[PDB]
Amino acid sequence: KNSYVNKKGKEVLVLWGIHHPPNSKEQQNLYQNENAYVSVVTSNYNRRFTPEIAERPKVRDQAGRMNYYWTLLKPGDTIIFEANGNLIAPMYAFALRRGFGSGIITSNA
Amino acid sequence: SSVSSFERFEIFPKESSWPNHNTNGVTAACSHEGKSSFYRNLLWLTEKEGSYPKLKNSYVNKKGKEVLVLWGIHHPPNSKEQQNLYQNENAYVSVVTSNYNRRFTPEIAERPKVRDQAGRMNYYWTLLKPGDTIIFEANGNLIAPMYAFALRRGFGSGIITSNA
Incomplete structure (x- = not known):
């Protein structure tokens, strides 16, 4: 269990992953607990995650899956990461400055 | 926004619906x-008496029109409070109708205190159709209805935010 408080005064965008092994033996040699979990929570966020161990097609030569999540952490809001396996914890997060006239375009110029 | 009125009737009477649970x-x-x-x-x-037996209580929509039922599901900050309030660490709730079917499970974990509460309280709802039954089955963490609302659909209604 690890915690961060938003001391930036700006919307901290946190990204984390939840891994899903293709087999139960890999779950037991990377994370020890077969019935592992993760539980990322804030003041208004609350979600538990659980690895769905199952045999799947290889993509980038990987039968495993890797579910990427996010939430906005408000000014002064605390986030509490908790787990006993499969949590791919953030190194870095991004304190956003809102601004208008921005937007995504697809250009070959 | 598409309702003109309803009645506040007690869908599950506080005393008689829960002989085995402190309400x-x-x-x-x-x-x-x-x-x-x-x-x-x-x-x-x-x-x-320090016990939460598995409840199973039912209501039927005999109002002849859309009964809006509201219930919460509690999620403790710790496994001590999960035991002390609900007896079962394997606690669940299951609210089911004709076209509705949903099971709930307490996501027990420590969280930032809001309104001086580390616990969470997730408010769910469903529309109960004319003559349709709703069945509440649980062994913990059900925050059952007292009252529900038999709707009367309106036109020209809507929610506005006004300081006038």
Whole structure:
């Protein structure tokens, strides 16, 4: 269990992953607990995650899956990461400055 | 926004619907008159004689029109409070109708205190059709209805935000 408080005064965008092994033996040699979990929570966020161990097609030569999540952490809001396996914890997060006239375009110029 | 009116009728009577569960669960977050109080349309069900037997209580929509039912599901900050209020760490709720079917499970984990409460309270709803039954089955963490609302659909209605 690890915690961060938003001391930036700006919307901290946190990204984390939840891994899903293709087999139960890999779950037991990377994370020890077969019935592992993760539980990322804030003041208004609350979600538990659980690895769905199952045999799947290889993509980038990987039968495993890797579910990427996010939430906005408000000014002064605390986030509490908790787990006993499969949590791919953030190194870095991004304190956003809102601004208008921005937007995504697809250009070959 | 598409309703003109409804009636506030007691869908599950506080005393008779729960002979095996203490219904007078009350919180400082829902305080009123300065003392701790609770929702006039919900019951916080807890242990009675230090036990929470598996409840199974049912209502049928005999109002002949869309009954909006409201219920909460509690999620403790710790496994001590999960035991002390609900007896079962393997606690669940299951609210089911003709076209509705949903099971709930307490996501127990420590969280940032809001309104001076580390616990969470997830408010769910469903429309109960004319003549349709709703069945509440649980062994913990069900915050059962007291009251529900038989709708009367309106036109020209809508929600506005006005300081006038």
